[PDB]
Every structure is written in structure tokens, then in C-alpha cells.
């Protein structure tokens, strides 16, 4: 039969309807008062967290991060620029808000490593995301066959190098075929054209 988890998920397909709607209308009020990075005891979306690697266990941490909505906060040119480069208003960043959020979280917990993240809604001027981080130094994790991989040296600061899930999709690495000529194996090896 259906898992209870399936219900959390089914609700989040329409965060603007039903009980979840009223729930969000309430939470955000408290959220808008919390900081930029708040550690939370339990994931707001259990199904999603667990689906992404979460585990009620020592060394596993979760944090909700808030980020402003919209295009790039850019300063206008202060020297000569051809018309093509005089833009300010329509310029958008190449890194999506979710990655920004994943980075702000990881910096807050210097010793932890990003595992994954998911959205938990947005009001008119900001978006919230919950990030799952892991303590690569806690033995409870170094002995977990399903996570100890994140303990390796080469997984250090993985979020800042785009090795995250959101980091990899944003890098255009989803497709294995047509369209990924300039993305795989990396954007930089392809002269930054993807």
C-alpha cells in the first residue's frame, strides 16, 4: 500500500492548495523573521529529504536558507562599453537561486558538506530552500555504507565546485546526448560556452 511518505509528497505537488497552503501561509510568517540560514531539527519535506539521502542519524544536518528573488543585483558600467554590454536590468546570473542557497548554507557550517537541497516555497520577494549537510568527520557517518563516500578528501567543498545535484543540472550535465557538447566533462574545459 501507499507509504505515509507518499502523502507528504502528494501534498507538495500543489503547495498552494489544501492544508499545505494554510500551513505555508503560517510558517513563512515565522520564517520571514528567522535569519538567512536557520538549522532545523526536522526536514519540512520528509519524503524529499529521505529521497535525496537524508537519514535520522548523528552527523546529518538540515538548514533552511532564504534568498532574494529575481535577476542579478548589478552595478552599471563606469567606463566605456559597447551597447551590447551596457545592460543592467535584464542581466541574470548563471547560477540558480537554489545553488546560491546551498552555498550560503555550506559557508555557515564550514566543517560540513552539502548533500542535496530542495525547495520549500516562496513569497513575493524571496525563496526558501532546505539544505541537507553531513559531518564527514563523525564516525556515525564514516561507518555508513550509504554515505561514507562524502567523507573522502576529494569531496571537500563539493558545493563550491558544482559537484552537487543542483550544481550538476545547472551545469547542463543532465543530457548525455545532443545538446551537451559544450557542457560535459566540464564547462571550463569547453571554453565556457555551455
Amino acid at each position: 500500500a501507499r507509504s505515509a511518505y507518499s502523502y507528504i509528497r502528494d501534498a507538495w505537488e500543489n503547495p498552494g492548495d489544501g492544508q499545505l497552503a494554510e500551513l505555508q501561509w503560517q510558517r513563512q510568517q515565522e520564517w520571514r523573521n528567522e535569519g538567512a540560514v536557520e538549522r532545523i531539527e526536522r526536514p519540512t519535506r520528509l519524503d524529499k529529504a529521505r529521497s535525496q539521502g537524508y537519514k535520522a542519524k548523528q552527523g546529518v544536518i538540515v538548514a533552511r536558507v532564504s534568498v532574494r528573488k529575481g535577476s542579478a543585483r548589478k552595478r552599471r558600467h563606469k567606463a566605456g562599453r559597447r551597447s551590447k554590454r551596457q545592460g543592467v536590468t535584464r542581466i541574470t546570473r548563471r547560477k540558480d537561486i537554489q545553488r546560491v542557497a546551498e552555498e550560503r548554507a555550506s559557508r555557515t557550517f564550514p566543517n560540513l558538506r552539502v548533500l542535496n537541497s530542495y525547495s520549500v516555497g516562496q513569497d513575493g520577494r524571496q525563496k526558501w530552500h532546505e539544505v541537507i549537510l553531513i559531518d564527514p568527520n563523525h564516525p556515525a557517518i564514516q561507518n555508513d555504507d550509504d554515505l561514507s563516500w562524502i567523507c573522502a578528501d576529494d569531496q571537500a567543498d563539493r558545493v563550491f565546485r558544482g559537484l552537487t545535484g543542483a550544481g550538476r543540472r545547472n551545469r547542463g550535465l543532465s543530457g548525455k546526448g545532443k545538446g551537451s557538447e559544450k557542457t560535459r566533462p566540464s564547462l571550463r574545459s569547453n571554453g565556457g560556452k555551455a
Binding site: 559597447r82 551597447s83 551590447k84 554590454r85
Partner: protein, 92 residues
């Protein structure tokens, strides 16, 4: 100048002389779906849009004749070279 609305002349389709009717070519409406229409949208962005930032040229003092010759029997039309004419009016 003046010109007959109908008159006998060669029909390239029938391959034989017949009465044709002369009419000025009414411009057709664009669909906005040609390749050029797509390039305009695609290539226009921040700053100058190259060729798409240009505007309508101008006008020659007198235009050439722009007519359609319709074969009175087979119903098909053909085009001819035009000649400069300040004004062109039909007779009947």
C-alpha cells in the same frame, strides 16, 4: 498615363493570344512566421540589434508599373517587366 483595362495579348500558359484583364498588384499580408521573423526575435537583445535596428529606406521620384495580367479564359495570370509611370489609370 492611360491604359486599357482589358486587351488581347499573349498568354504564356495557354500559349496563344487571348483577352487579358490588367490589375494593380494589391500587397499581401505578412504572416510573421517566415525565417526572417524568427531571426528578428531571436537576435534582438540588449543594446543595438544590428540590422534589426535599421529603419525604412525612402522613395524614388517615380515608381515602376506593378501589374498582373490575367488570361480571360484559362483564368491564370503572369507578370511583365514594369516601366516608370508617375501615374497609371485604366480605361473602362
Amino acid at each position: 498615363m492611360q491604359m486599357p483595362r482589358r486587351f488581347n495579348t499573349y498568354c504564356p500558359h495557354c500559349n496563344e493570344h487571348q483577352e487579358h484583364e490588367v490589375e494593380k498588384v494589391r500587397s499581401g499580408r505578412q504572416t510573421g512566421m517566415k525565417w526572417i521573423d524568427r531571426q528578428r526575435e531571436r537576435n534582438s537583445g540588449i543594446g543595438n540589434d544590428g540590422k534589426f535596428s535599421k529603419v525604412p529606406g525612402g522613395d524614388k521620384p517615380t515608381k515602376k508599373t506593378d501589374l498582373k495580367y490575367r488570361c480571360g479564359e484559362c483564368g491564370k495570370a503572369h507578370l511583365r517587366e514594369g516601366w516608370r509611370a508617375g501615374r497609371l489609370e485604366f480605361q473602362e
